[PDB]
Nucleic acid binder design. Structure first.
Ligand code: MG
Ligand code: MG
Ligand code: MG
Ligand code: MG
Ligand code: MG
Ligand code: MG
Ligand code: MG
Ligand code: MG
Ligand code: MG
Ligand code: MG
Ligand code: MG
Ligand code: MG
Ligand code: MG
Ligand code: MG
Ligand code: MG
Ligand code: MG
Ligand code: MG
Ligand code: MG
Ligand code: MG
Ligand code: MG
Ligand code: MG
Ligand code: MG
Ligand code: MG
Ligand code: MG
Ligand code: MG
Ligand code: MG
Lengths: 58, 185, 51, 222, 172, 159
RNA sequence: AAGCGUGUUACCUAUACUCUACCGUCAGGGUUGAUAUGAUGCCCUGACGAGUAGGCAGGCGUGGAGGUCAGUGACGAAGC
RNA sequence: UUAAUUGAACGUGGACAUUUGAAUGAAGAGCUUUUAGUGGGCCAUUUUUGGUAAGCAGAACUGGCGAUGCGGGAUGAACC
RNA sequence: GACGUAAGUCAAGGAUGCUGGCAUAAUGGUUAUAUGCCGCCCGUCUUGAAACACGGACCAAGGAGUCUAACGUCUAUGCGAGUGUUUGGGUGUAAAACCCAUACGCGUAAUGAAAGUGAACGUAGGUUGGGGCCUCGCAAGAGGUGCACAAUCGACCGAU
RNA sequence: CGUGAAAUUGUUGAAAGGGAAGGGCAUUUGAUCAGACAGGCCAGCAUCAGUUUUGGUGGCA
């Protein structure tokens, strides 16, 4: 026997009953998908700034 | 009729009492309910809420965690407060002399603290000597190192632990876990 | 325990608004305006009565 | 001898000085109101005397009453009505008029009646149906100290100070208006004056902008 | 709406740098109150000039009183109205003591004889006919004959009671 | 049966503009993109490589990666009842700087200058923007501007 | 016209709106050197109350078991 | 990476404050685990496909009935 | 708060004052009946049941999410880098209660198909937050420390 | 042949009854019933308070 094929009826009411949410930004997002050459050199740049600050502060 | 913006009659969802029937715990709660009401020190309200917590929500605090906390500069003479159990840790070979206030001490933890010259104190004696939590260091154990937490949020590419009885070869290490067999998660 | 409405219950009206006593005494709710005698210009009256 | 008398004498004298302050501020407001209204009346007369027209400054404040029930409301009007705090039928609130708010009134016209409230209607509304939102609770004003303890940091020490901030839409209108719990009005005491409410006021119904006739409607409901 | 009221409504486009002091257009509007009069003003300026309520401004609204409320006048009225199948112009004559009640009579007449709602009527013009023999409709012309007098036969008296003991008369 | 290929229903969206076919002008290639730049997505049907899917047409995102010929863009996409982070590899042709960000920076500069000059005098110099306000009162004279207008007009067929 | 078009008022009455009380629920608070011993207590303040499928909570009732009431009972238990 | 501290990314240190950068509201906000039922729908306005049409079949957005009594439409799941 | 110079009073954080009848079926409750208005038969499947859909003539008694092995989340409790006496042994007032050795299980190490190898550069790291605590401040606030937790970049173990 | 329920039934008593009966709210009538005099029941007037409804009249713009 035949029945309903598709409908988006009630779908926005379900979606809104728990408040369609933004993706909750952070400082320092994941560096996923960044260019590997930059990422490799960023590692050494951060290592050097860690040395410089540690020597500066102690 | 009222166009309700918020769910009606919603409970706070926070414990307002220990689920425990321990009479001594309820006496400690009677004490810190008074102190949280009659003082404005935030320490008393924090301890009260910690007194309500469940077991998984008050993990053990190790003596070595306490000793690391005492290595914080300017903290070496602070009364460590643990609303829970303090366990022993043989991985530390030099324990400092300090006063630790906790709900429960293990035999090893108490012996280590006392052998260091320190003191083990109940929360009511802490309330007597530091009514506003003066010079106190509240420590908490690691909540997310529970075995059960490994399995939360399981799914493709999530990298959590599958709920599984037997481990090793033949137990979920095949199609779905390597490209040679279908795909990899 | 009981909301006594100002605008009646003169006592509550005086607990709020101490100026109500001066208002009633000086009849500031029935204040006469000074009789000035300006007259609209002819262009206004003609425009108003225009068909 | 707990020295209750010193506390009582200081506290009564403090009450007298606060009441002297409120008294002189209510007198100044009354001067400001009457001077303003006479200024517009004379300015209209002088423009007519000179062959000109005095275009009265557009109204800065509206009072809005939700006149429609809760069921069967589309979601955009439903959201705007919630943001105007009109969560039930015959609830009313004050809105400061800008483009950002006139567009909201445009979205909720078929569900509300609004217009421009006079001083008398604001006073009677605050005096009879005036409640403050204090620590999430609806508190009857009923005393000036309740207002000063919650809006004194904006310079609002009395119920008349609050009315002044509302009608002369002052720098702290927003704080003062939100402090006021949305007025819960009755049905009109002599009826709505129409056979069918849910047509525009222009069309012979009840809703939409009915600018100065909002005073008669609100007075009947208050 | 105890009756209509006649308002003069003067408005203009909003002034700009290009054109300060615009032209000040004015209409006479028959409306139940100020709000409807202003609405009718904009609705009619909608059809004549490029302007709407948002690009314009109401300079003045003033009620217009009858110069002589207690003088009986013959009014000629030009109306435009929409019937169910098209738009039609007509001219009618109404005898009464004021423009506002003549227009009130006119709306009642249009509703009764043509089922034309206030929605579907434009008052093009109202003007008193200052001379007899310029009156053209016979239903108003019959009332201008010299020494006019008619009886009111079959007077029906209103009874406050439910039962009468007299078997009444309709004399007059 | 149905059809849901990658570029379905893009007949008009990926059109070139009228009399605007051909090679892409060199400005789009000389524009510089840094991480954090806010960019608008509009696909160029001439450049078939590195195209955004049709969902991202008209979407505005943030640059997170810069490569030789392309830019990594983060877009927030409503999937069901939440938003998901999407990362797009788009060549520079399908990308332009968003003028919203440039104009906001202009306001930030102007706020700084106004704050700096206000520190000399005039505390609380109203940095925030305001919604358009109701008009003040005004006097409209009839000198050379006497009101004069007609009534509604009669009906004519015009045909 | 107690019909049709239109206009004006008065008037009728919903579990809706305003105020008051009582019940319950939720929330926010108060209360210990006799809280003039009920602190899962007492008290203050505000808001709220539709409901299938379903979830949860606090209670009521039945057969048997440990403890207590040194409980009831042939001067009448239980059952009806 | 640049011809080249030229840049890139991350930073040390210093300056800025509640009109801190529109309005309105905000009922606490954020977050986690776990598990029920459900996975036949139907109806109204508007958009809309097949069809002469259907109380027909099929989609869009919204509001409803289902799950809902109450006043009104005599009567009636959905209309007011 | 008001009034009064003060005494004190008041309609000012919720009714008092004066007077009468009766003290019983008088008010009230219960019940039968009458009157006005209203009220379709429950249960069930169903988009939709009062249905010309099904089960049900009546009554009593009986009558349907149980126990078990293994397990997930949550909670209580004991002990805690451990934990579990009860297979068994000792003992007993004898299927109870009480006591106990060696093991064994799970945990304290992972990873690789496997052979195998196997966890501190550092105050067990850096950055951003972070309750609480500390110091200075009437306070706001500022500074120090910052457990849990969150994001992120590293370091270490195994595989490649 | 302990107790001895319900369905169903006889008798007596009460009551109602023009094509069902039963039910809800309210009250009348009949029958029936509890408790209190160390204030229990029902009312009336006055001065107030809270919320309202309907009049009269004054002063202003
Ligand atoms: Mg289906
Ligand atoms: Mg009435
Ligand atoms: Mg296609
Ligand atoms: Mg009629
Ligand atoms: Mg309910
Ligand atoms: Mg039993
Ligand atoms: Mg017996
Ligand atoms: Mg099914
Ligand atoms: Mg169903
Ligand atoms: Mg109806
Ligand atoms: Mg009908
Ligand atoms: Mg109906
Ligand atoms: Mg009776
Ligand atoms: Mg019926
Ligand atoms: Mg069927
Ligand atoms: Mg049924
Ligand atoms: Mg069947
Ligand atoms: Mg059968
Ligand atoms: Mg059977
Ligand atoms: Mg049974
Ligand atoms: Mg027997
Ligand atoms: Mg027998
Ligand atoms: Mg029987
Ligand atoms: Mg018969
Ligand atoms: Mg009956
Ligand atoms: Mg009264």
């Amino acid at each position: 026997a035949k029945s309903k094929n598709h409908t988006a009826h009630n779908q926005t009411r379900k979606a809104h009953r728990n408040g369609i949410k933004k993706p909750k930004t952070y400082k320092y997002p994941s560096l996923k998908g960044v260019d590997p050459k930059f990422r490799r050199n960023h590692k050494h740049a951060l290592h050097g700034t860690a040395k410089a600050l540690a020597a500066a502060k102690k | 009729g009222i166009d309700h913006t918020s769910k009606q009659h919603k409970r706070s969802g926070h414990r307002t009492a220990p689920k425990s029937d321990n009479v001594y715990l309820k006496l400690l709660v009677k004490l810190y309910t008074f102190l949280a009401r009659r003082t404005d020190a935030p320490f008393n309200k924090v301890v009260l809420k910690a007194l309500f917590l469940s077991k998984i929500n008050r993990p053990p605090v190790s003596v070595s965690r306490i000793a690391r906390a005492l290595k914080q500069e300017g903290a070496a003479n602070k009364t460590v407060v643990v609303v829970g159990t303090v366990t022993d840790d043989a991985r530390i070979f030099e324990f400092p002399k300090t006063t630790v206030a906790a709900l429960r001490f293990t035999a090893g933890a108490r012996a280590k603290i006392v052998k260091a010259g320190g003191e083990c104190i109940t929360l009511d004696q802490l309330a007597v000597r530091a009514p506003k939590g003066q010079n106190t260091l509240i420590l908490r154990g690691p909540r997310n190192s529970r075995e059960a937490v490994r399995h939360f949020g399981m799914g493709p590419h999530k990298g959590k632990a599958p709920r599984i009885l037997s481990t090793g070869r033949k137990f979920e290490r095949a199609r779905g876990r390597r490209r040679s067999k279908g795909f990899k998660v | 325990v009981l909301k006594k409405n100002p605008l009646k219950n003169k006592q509550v009206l005086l607990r709020l608004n101490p100026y109500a006593k001066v208002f009633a005494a000086e009849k500031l709710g029935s204040k006469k305006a000074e009789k000035t005698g300006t007259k609209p210009a002819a262009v206004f009256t003609e425009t108003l009565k225009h068909d | 001898a707990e020295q209750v008398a010193a506390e009582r004498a200081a506290r009564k004298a403090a009450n007298k000085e606060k009441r002297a302050i409120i008294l002189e501020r209510n007198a100044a407001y009354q001067k400001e109101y009457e001077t303003a209204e006479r200024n517009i009346i004379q300015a209209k007369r002088d423009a007519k005397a000179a062959g000109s027209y005095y275009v009265e400054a557009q109204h800065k404040l509206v009072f809005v009453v939700r006149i429609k029930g809760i069921n069967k409301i589309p979601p955009k009007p439903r959201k705007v009505l919630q943001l105007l705090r009109l969560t039930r039928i015959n609830s009313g609130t004050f809105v400061k008029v800008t483009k950002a708010t006139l567009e909201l009134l445009k979205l909720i016209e078929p569900y509300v009646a609004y217009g421009y409230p006079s001083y008398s209607t604001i006073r009677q509304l605050v005096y009879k149906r005036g409640f403050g939102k204090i620590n999430k609770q609806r508190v009857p004003l009923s005393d000036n100290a309740i207002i000063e303890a919650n809006l004194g940091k904006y310079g609002i020490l009395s119920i008349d100070d609050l009315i002044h901030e509302i009608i002369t839409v002052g720098p702290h209108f927003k704080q003062a208006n939100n402090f006021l719990w949305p007025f819960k009005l009755s049905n009109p005491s002599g009826g709505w004056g129409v056979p069918r409410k849910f047509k525009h006021f222009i069309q012979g119904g009840s809703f939409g902008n009915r600018e100065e006739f909002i005073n008669k409607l609100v007075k009947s409901m208050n | 709406m105890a009756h209509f009221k006649e308002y003069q409504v003067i408005g203009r486009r909003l002034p700009t740098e290009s054109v300060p002091e615009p032209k000040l257009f004015r209409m006479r509007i028959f409306a139940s109150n100020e709000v409807i009069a202003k609405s009718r003003y904009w609705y009619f300026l909608q059809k004549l000039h490029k302007v709407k309520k948002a690009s314009g401004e109401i300079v003045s609204i003033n009620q217009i009183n009858e110069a002589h409320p207690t003088k009986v006048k013959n009014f000629g009225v030009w109306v435009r109205y929409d019937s169910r199948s098209g738009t039609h112009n007509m001219y009618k004559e109404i005898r009464d003591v004021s423009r506002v009640a003549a227009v009130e009579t006119l709306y009642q007449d249009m509703a009764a004889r043509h089922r034309a709602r206030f929605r579907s009527i434009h008052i093009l013009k109202v003007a008193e006919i200052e001379k007899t023999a310029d009156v053209k409709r016979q239903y108003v012309k019959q009332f201008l004959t010299k020494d006019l007098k008619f009886p009111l036969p079959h007077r029906v008296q209103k009874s406050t009671k439910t039962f009468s003991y007299k078997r009444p008369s309709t004399f007059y | 049966g149905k059809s849901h290929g990658y570029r379905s229903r893009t007949r008009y969206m990926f059109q070139r503009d009228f009399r605007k076919h051909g090679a892409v002008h060199l400005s789009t290639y000389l524009k510089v993109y840094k991480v954090g730049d806010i960019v608008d997505i509009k696909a160029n049907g001439s450049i078939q490589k590195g195209m955004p899917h049709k969902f991202y047409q008209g979407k505005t995102g943030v640059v997170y990666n810069v490569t030789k010929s392309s830019v990594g863009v983060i877009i927030n996409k409503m999937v069901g009842n939440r938003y998901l982070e999407k990362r797009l590899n788009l060549r520079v042709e399908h990308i332009k700087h968003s003028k919203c960000r440039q104009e906001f920076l202009e306001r930030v500069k102007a706020n700084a200058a106004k704050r700096a000059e206000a520190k000399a005098q005039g505390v609380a110099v109203q940095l925030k923007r305001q919604p358009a306000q109701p008009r003040e009162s005004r006097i409209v004279s009839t000198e050379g501007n006497v009101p004069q207008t007609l009534a509604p007009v009669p009906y004519e067929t015009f045909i």
